[PDB]
Design a protein around this ligand. Structure first.
Ligand code: 698
Length: 549
């Protein structure tokens, strides 16, 4: 079973594509080494096609079926409802790709008779026909990185009308089923504060902790027809309306399992027999399947008191050490089992005995201290990709503002606070756009957020301590500092100076602006203001699922 077959028609862009970092008058103030930042384009799609295209073999044993039965028993306790057309329309992002059939995302949200009538017709066809593959578009993503070049990632998605029907049939299921089935292991239920707390508590719950990340090579491609049918059998355990059962069976047979791929010019590029990246069930499906395969590999490997944390294809296991030699051997058996289940590693997993050395959701635990000097754990990452993207967004308006998502999700970090907040608040001040709502993504869902709302968002997701962290670790400081030399970003001392300016400017404006100056930039003044609570999201993952929050 090959993950894809190809005709030889090219994956085509739908618009002009920039690969070189755009530069304006603000660029050099953030980043000098411009030639290190690039965006992927369709020109590299051929290279990605080669990576994602392979044969899958699967060998399924008793541990696999044992975990599956347990998951199904939990899933049987879920009661889910159909969403009305209206409800599903309201979940559609304002800038979601328009339909081939003469209406767009705004027509959908506005419940135009054209959009609604077509959606009813798509729904009825799902009920009537559980056989015919549904068309999908394949595109090369344009994403920004620092050199050391990756090929474009590919996205596969059905028409807007289908996307709305998906929401009707499955939004409630994908929202509620995974936490029921996986409990505390379900990663999307945690804000960053809750996630770091769960990781630390999980780590402290072991007599002698051992943990590891497992990186599956090209997870979407490893997903087989079996996996997707197993997923459907899980959804079908829920207490559902008969009409929902039928639409889910239909979406599975006609879309989820596979189908034809069409380029932006309407030419046939080939055929998919693996996970589509751009459907509603991508995140929930990947999470279930990763959790199933890994729970079964843990038993194969005889790992003791395994605690998993799963976000799609992102997987972390923390368990009881059996000793160093025993743990390394167990990890090999875990990997052999994952491989048989069709999920071979990209890089071999490594046992860790220090929590801060485990990377999960591209992040690691680290520690700083609050106002009182008490230890605070928080999640951070190498800032290289966030800063390359910030540089891009400095000179170019983009559909999604990663700088804003990074400020929200990495608010307690040295680099988000000193660089991202300082840089973008300065830019927003200059343009008097503090009040302008901007689109960003959190766990792949789309939010419209005004920068002026940041103080309360951060306090909720991270705690008040986020505004007073200091004495960061030498390792964390060292990683940030070396990233800045690599990219030609000004040293942290320059950012401190800039932040004092930005801060003073914000305070003057009173109201919300002054709240941003006071809370976001307290780290920048030598005699700190006493920071006190302020007056005036994490249920499930929907990456690729076209969800507006
Ligand atoms: C600008 C980003 C903040 C947006 C992004 C997204 O999924 O839409 C993409 C980000 C990415 O790494 O691709 C990050 C995610 N990491 C792992 C899964 S999702 N993203 C997160 O939303 C995200 C950041 C940080 C975190 C933790 C710090 C690990 C809580 C979870 C999720």
């Amino acid at each position: 079973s090959m993950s894809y077959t190809w005709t030889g028609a090219l994956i085509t862009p739908c618009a002009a594509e920039e690969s070189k970092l755009p530069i304006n008058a603000l660029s050099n103030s953030l980043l000098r080494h411009h030639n290190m930042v690039y965006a992927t384009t369709s020109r590299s799609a051929s290279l990605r096609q080669k990576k994602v295209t392979f044969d899958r073999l699967q060998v399924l044993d008793d541990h696999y079926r044992d975990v599956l039965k347990e998951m199904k028993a939990k899933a049987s306790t879920v009661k889910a409802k159909l969403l009305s057309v209206e409800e599903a329309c309201k979940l559609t992002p304002p800038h979601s790709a328009k339909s081939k059939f003469g209406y767009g995302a705004k027509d959908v949200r506005n419940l135009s008779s054209k959009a609604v009538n077509h959606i009813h017709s798509v729904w009825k066809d799902l009920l009537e026909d559980t056989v015919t593959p549904i068309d999908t578009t394949i595109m090369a993503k344009n994403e920004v990185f620092c050199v050391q070049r990756k090929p474009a990632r590919l996205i596969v998605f059905p028409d807007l009308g289908v996307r709305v029907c998906e929401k009707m049939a499955l939004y409630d299921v994908v929202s509620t089923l995974p936490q029921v089935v996986m409990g505390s292991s379900y990663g999307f239920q945690y804000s960053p504060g809750q996630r770091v707390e769960f990781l630390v508590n999980t780590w402290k719950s072991k007599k002698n902790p051992m943990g590891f990340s497992y990186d599956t090579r090209c997870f979407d491609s490893t997903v087989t027809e079996n996996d997707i049918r197993v997923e459907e059998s899980i959804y079908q355990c829920c207490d559902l309306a008969p009409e929902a059962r039928q639409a889910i069976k239909s979406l599975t047979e006609r879309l989820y399992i596979g189908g034809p791929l069409t380029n932006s010019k309407g030419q046939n590029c080939g055929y998919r027999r693996c996970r589509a990246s751009g459907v509603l069930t991508t995140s929930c499906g990947n999470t279930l399947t990763c959790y199933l395969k890994a729970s079964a590999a843990c038993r194969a490997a005889k790992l003791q008191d395994c605690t998993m944390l799963v976000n799609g294809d992102d997987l972390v296991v923390i368990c009881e050490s059996a000793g160093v030699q025993e743990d390394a051997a167990s990890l090999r058996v875990f990997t052999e089992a994952m491989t048989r289940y069709s999920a071979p590693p990209g890089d071999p997993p490594q046992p860790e005995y220090d929590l801060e050395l485990i990377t999960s959701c591209s992040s690691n635990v680290s520690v700083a201290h609050d106002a009182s000097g008490k230890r605070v754990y928080y999640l951070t990452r190498d800032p290289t990709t966030p800063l390359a993207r910030a540089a891009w967004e400095t000179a170019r308006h983009t559909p999604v503002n990663s700088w804003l998502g990074n400020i929200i999700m990495y608010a307690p970090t040295l680099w988000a606070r000193m660089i991202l907040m300082t840089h973008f608040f300065s830019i927003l001040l200059a343009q008097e756009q503090l009040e302008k709502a901007l689109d960003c993504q959190i766990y792949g869902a789309c939010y419209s957020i005004e920068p002026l709302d940041l103080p309360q968002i951060i306090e909720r997701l991270h705690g008040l301590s986020a505004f007073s962290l200091h004495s960061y670790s030498p390792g964390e400081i060292n990683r940030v500092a070396s990233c800045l030399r690599k990219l030609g970003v000004p040293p942290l001392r320059v950012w401190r100076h800039r932040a004092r300016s930005v801060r003073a400017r914000l305070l003057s404006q009173g109201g919300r602006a002054a709240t941003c100056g006071k809370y976001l930039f307290n780290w920048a003044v030598k005699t700190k203001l006493k920071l006190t609570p302020i007056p005036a999201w994490f249920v499930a993952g929907y990456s690729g699922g076209d969800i507006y929050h």
